Amino acid sequence: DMYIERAGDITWEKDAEVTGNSPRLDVALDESGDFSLV
Amino acid sequence: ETTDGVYRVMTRRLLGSTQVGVGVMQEGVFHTMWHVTKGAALRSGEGRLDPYWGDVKQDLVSYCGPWKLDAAWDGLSEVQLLAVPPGERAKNIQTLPGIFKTKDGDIGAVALDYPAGTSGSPILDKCGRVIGLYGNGVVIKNGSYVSAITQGKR
Ligand SMILES: N=C(N)N[C@@H]1CCCCNC(=O)[C@H](CCCCN)NC(=O)[C@H](CCCCN)NC(=O)Cc2ccc(cc2)CNC(=O)CCCNC1=O
């Protein structure tokens, strides 16, 4: 049995840490809902 | 509890309590990714949440009503992943999305790598609207992760 418990409000944080790049990737989505690189 | 916000999805079928994912409560509907719950019913305190809509191909599922979240990335601005990792406090992480280019169009993606139980955490725009959920993506060359910004249709 799964259960849920609240973890926070959904709000933008002005002091947020920033990371991650922004790749452009060619992908395909199969009938299983899985992405694969093309 | 039906207050709007982000929620951990927990199970007891394994050792301890285990966070299997995350989801969003908005307008009395709970939103998560399909692979988190596989469509099973959820408990919320003494009340039960039954699935209402889902789609394996989108990897999405909603409980107690139809999918409510309809904001979308603007294609230009940074966003925040509100990551809720297992056993750790919710934390906002800002990033500029990349793009999944597919035969049927393009989809924002975020190059952020968190534990598997972080699946379903919301990605927000600068207005605080949920533009999609984290956790369905691909593993790139170096071995790290890029998640689609997965949004449903309201
Ligand atoms: N792997 C990285 N860097 N982070 C992932 C973060 C995943 C964030 C949450 N999303 C998922 O859990 C979903 C579930 C499936 C959705 C199906 N709709 N998962 C995927 O979206 C890819 C999509 C792949 C589709 C390809 N056709 N699947 C995986 O990563 C599986 C995988 C697990 C573990 C490793 C390597 C790969 C080894 N690393 C480690 O153990 C580090 C710690 C665990 N880290 C990780 O699990």
Author numbering:
A (entry chain A): 50 to 87
B (entry chain B): 17 to 170
What sentences appear in the manuscript?
For the most potent inhibitor 4 of this series, a crystal structure in complex with bZiPro has been determined. The structure revealed an improved dual interaction pattern of the P1 guanidino group with Asp129 and two additional contacts to the carbonyl oxygen of Gly159. An intramolecular H‐bond between the P1 guanidine and the P4 carbonyl oxygen further stabilizes the inhibitor conformation. The crystal structures of bZiPro with all inhibitors containing a d‐configured P1 residue revealed a preferred interaction of the dN(Ca)Lys guanidine to Asp129, enabling an additional contact to the carbonyl of Gly159.
Due to their essential function in the processing of the viral polyprotein, they emerged as potential antiviral drug targets.
